[PDB]
Amino acid sequence: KWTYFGPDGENSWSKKYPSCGGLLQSPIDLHSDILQYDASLTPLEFQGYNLSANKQFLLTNNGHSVKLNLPSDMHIQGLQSRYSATQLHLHWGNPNDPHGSEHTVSGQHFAAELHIVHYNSDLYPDASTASNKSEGLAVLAVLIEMGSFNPSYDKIFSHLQHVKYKGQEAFVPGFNIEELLPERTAEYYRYRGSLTTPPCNPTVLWTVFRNPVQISQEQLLALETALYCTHMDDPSPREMINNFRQVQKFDERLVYTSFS
Amino acid sequence: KWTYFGPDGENSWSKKYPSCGGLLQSPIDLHSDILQYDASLTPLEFQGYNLSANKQFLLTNNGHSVKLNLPSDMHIQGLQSRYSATQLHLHWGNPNDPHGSEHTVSGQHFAAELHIVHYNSDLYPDASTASNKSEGLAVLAVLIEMGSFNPSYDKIFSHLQHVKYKGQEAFVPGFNIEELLPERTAEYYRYRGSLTTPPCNPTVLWTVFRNPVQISQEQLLALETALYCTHMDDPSPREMINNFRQVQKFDERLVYTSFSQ
Ligand SMILES: NS(=O)(=O)c1c(F)c(F)c(S(=O)(=O)CCc2ccccc2)c(NCc2ccccc2)c1F
Numbered sequence: 001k002w003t004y005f006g007p008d009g010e011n012s013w014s015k016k017y018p019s020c021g022g023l024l025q026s027p028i029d030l031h032s033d034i035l036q037y038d039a040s041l042t043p044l045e046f047q048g049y050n051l052s053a054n055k056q057f058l059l060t061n062n063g064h065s066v067k068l069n070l071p072s073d074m075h076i077q078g079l080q081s082r083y084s085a086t087q088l089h090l091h092w093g094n095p096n097d098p099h100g101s102e103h104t105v106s107g108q109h110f111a112a113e114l115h116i117v118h119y120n121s122d123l124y125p126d127a128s129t130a131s132n133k134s135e136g137l138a139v140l141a142v143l144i145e146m147g148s149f150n151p152s153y154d155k156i157f158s159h160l161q162h163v164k165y166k167g168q169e170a171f172v173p174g175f176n177i178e179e180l181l182p183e184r185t186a187e188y189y190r191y192r193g194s195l196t197t198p199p200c201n202p203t204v205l206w207t208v209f210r211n212p213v214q215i216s217q218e219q220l221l222a223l224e225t226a227l228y229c230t231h232m233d234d235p236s237p238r239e240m241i242n243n244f245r246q247v248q249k250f251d252e253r254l255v256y257t258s259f260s
Numbered sequence: 261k262w263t264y265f266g267p268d269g270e271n272s273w274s275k276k277y278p279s280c281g282g283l284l285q286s287p288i289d290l291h292s293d294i295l296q297y298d299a300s301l302t303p304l305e306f307q308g309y310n311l312s313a314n315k316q317f318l319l320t321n322n323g324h325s326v327k328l329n330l331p332s333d334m335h336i337q338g339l340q341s342r343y344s345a346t347q348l349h350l351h352w353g354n355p356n357d358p359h360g361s362e363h364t365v366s367g368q369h370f371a372a373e374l375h376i377v378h379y380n381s382d383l384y385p386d387a388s389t390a391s392n393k394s395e396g397l398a399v400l401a402v403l404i405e406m407g408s409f410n411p412s413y414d415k416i417f418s419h420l421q422h423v424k425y426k427g428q429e430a431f432v433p434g435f436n437i438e439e440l441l442p443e444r445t446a447e448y449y450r451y452r453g454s455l456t457t458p459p460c461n462p463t464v465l466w467t468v469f470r471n472p473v474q475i476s477q478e479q480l481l482a483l484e485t486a487l488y489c490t491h492m493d494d495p496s497p498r499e500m501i502n503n504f505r506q507v508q509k510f511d512e513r514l515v516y517t518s519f520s521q
């Protein structure tokens with residue numbers, strides 16, 4: 001199965017997953033030469049993000065990240081179609097080099113990155129169907145850096161030891177997912193791109209917020225050391241670290257910004 | 261065949277050239293978390309770099325870059341062995357985003373990058389043989405930024421209009437190749453990596469100098485606009501631009517430096 005290191009690592013994805021060597025690949029480096037202010041871009045509105053604490057949502061180690069399943073009643077407004085949530089998950093680096101965001105800003109990697117994945121529910125019945133179809137997916141990306149302890153991110157991180165191996169799952173009580181978002185969400189970069197993992201479908205409208213959120217060094221280290229890519233019975237266990245793709249070429253493409 | 265853009269672009273090199281998906285790939289981002297000072301890293305001694313101005317050296321557009329053939333009497337001493345020069349060539353971006361070095365520093369891409377390719381002539385008969393062998397190659401990299409005109413790089417750049425197309429050649433009179441090197445060559449990053457083009461052999465000892473050189477905006481725009489990947493006869497020409505590979509993962513690996521900060 002594909003990985004982020006060794007023979008089946010990212011430079012090999014295109015062998016089995018052609019789109020990984022096709023058009024509109026993500027992530028990218030967000031830098032002045034490719035940015036253009038677009039005054040018509042409007043603030044997103046997050047609806048249904050405040051999940052009932054009496055409900056529960058599945059957290060799964062899928063062998064590539066840790067993901068939290070999200071209900072289709074959670075959605076975003078401010079795009080041309082309604083997009084409804086399906087899951088969120090994270091990318092991170094490793095304790096020797098704690099810089100594993102997927103997007104970079106002026107060449108700099110943040111410690112980690114949160115993706116909140118939505119599908120076009122106006123056009124499509126579910127994420128699976130949406131994922132390889134035009135306009136299918138909208139992902140929100142939050143850059144994460146070291147700093148103060150984040151009680152909100154801890155509503156995910158405190159359950160990590162129950163999902164250490166691939167295929168393991170744990171239910172998490174609902175909490176307000178808006179608490180994972182940064183300050184001033186109105187300021188963001190927006191561009192057409194792709195899944196940043198196989199099958200790399202070029203069907204994602206990306207919004208990356210301008211402002212990072214902070215988690216503590218202890219939180220980041222927990223995220224970096226908690227998880228394995230492999231099933232509990234794999235003869236060759238692999239730690240889940242550096243699960244972020246290198247940035248892609250972005251030529252002639254432009255990234256639009258909601259801030260000037 | 262292979263390119264830097266489209267279906268034959270870098271995410272697909274590993275399909276034809278399996279080492280491009282292997283270990284020890286270059287180029288990389290040089291950033292403090294992966295740097296360690298190594299005081300045993302001594303000055304390279306450049307020898308035979310002051311090339312004869314009575315001799316001419318072949319410049320070629322090989323459809324991926326522009327390369328200048330170098331003589332085997334040019335070498336660097338310092339390494340476990342003598343490494344003898346074989347060619348130099350460049351990598352660059354395009355005028356809309358003039359940032360096409362291959363190595364980056366704390367995420368900064370530079371405008372362009374010069375590579376001076378050498379092979380271990382002590383152990384191996386030529387660079388072809390050496391390129392499959394552990395540490396068989398040594399490549400010196402000079403980061404290039406946009407700034408002052410550089411009369412020495414112009415010894416090469418003044419010839420670009422006779423090599424506009426794949427397969428075309430020009431002669432360049434010898435000049436002192438040390439003049440293409442930056443200030444304080446003693447200061448460099450060193451690591452074990454690969455050819456940054458197919459076949460991506462993990463056989464290169466990298467030396468990237470700490471300090472960049474400058475060329476002019478005009479020189480940079482000539483380098484970015486003068487050259488084509490395609491033959492003269494080709495009705496669908498492709499500009500030779502953005503001929504640099506993206507940085508590669510570099511985990512469990514360290515880059516050693518001959519300077520401390
Ligand atoms: N980092 S990302 O946001 O672009 C991303 C992918 F790159 C990606 F490939 C996928 S997926 O098709 O492989 C599904 C599994 C997955 C989950 C988390 C990280 C990597 C892979 C998802 N997932 C979103 C999704 C949901 C339903 C159907 C299709 C895609 C995904 F969210």
Ligand SMILES: NS(=O)(=O)c1c(F)c(F)c(S(=O)(=O)CCc2ccccc2)c(NCc2ccccc2)c1F
Pocket residue numbers: 322324325327346347349375377387388391399454455456457458459464
């Ligand atoms: N980035 S690089 O320094 O590692 C590099 C190039 F970028 C490059 F374009 C070349 S190339 O001009 O020679 C064409 C690609 C190639 C590379 C190796 C073998 C066949 C074709 C070499 N070339 C290194 C080299 C020089 C002489 C003999 C063998 C290899 C090369 F080493």
Ligand SMILES: [Zn+2]
Pocket residue numbers: 089090091115196
């Ligand atoms: Zn993701």
Ligand SMILES: [Zn+2]
Pocket residue numbers: 349350351375456
């Ligand atoms: Zn090169």
